[PDB]
Write a protein that binds this ligand. Structure first.
Ligand SMILES: CNC(=O)c1cc(Cl)ccn1
Length: 116
């Protein structure tokens, strides 16, 4: 509270670390459904069903232009990508399984990087 400071982590490497993690996502072989925005004019139903589209290149642009206040908002966008994927794609589809794979890959990188 006011004048009662909570010890907080050193965040100075966060930006660099998130860029690193995002580069690893982008270079993963199953990243292909997520590299670019879904083409809302070629994909039937997506615009109406998915209220907040997100993709890696958009995350990269936001990361590169100071649009993430902190680690957590970055992680929210990454998770949104896989959340949208699950919403729209069958689990037993190539894109659906890509999503589950990429999510798992992210969470491991995330844990390995930031959680002790
Ligand atoms: C993340 N990409 C998708 O969810 C998607 C799904 C379909 Cl069917 C076509 C293009 N993109």
């Amino acid at each position: 509270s006011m004048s009662v400071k909570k010890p907080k982590r050193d965040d100075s490497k966060d930006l660099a670390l998130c860029s690193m993690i995002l580069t690893e996502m982008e270079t993963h072989e199953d990243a292909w459904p997520f590299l670019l925005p879904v083409n809302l004019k070629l994909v039937p139903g997506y615009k109406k069903v998915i209220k907040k589209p997100m993709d890696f290149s958009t995350i990269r642009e936001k990361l590169s232009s100071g649009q993430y206040p902190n680690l957590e908002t970055f992680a929210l966008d990454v998770r949104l990508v896989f959340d949208n994927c699950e919403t729209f794609n069958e689990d037993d589809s190539d894109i659906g399984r890509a999503g589950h794979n990429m999510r798992k890959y992210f969470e491991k990188k995330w844990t390995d990087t930031f959680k002790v």
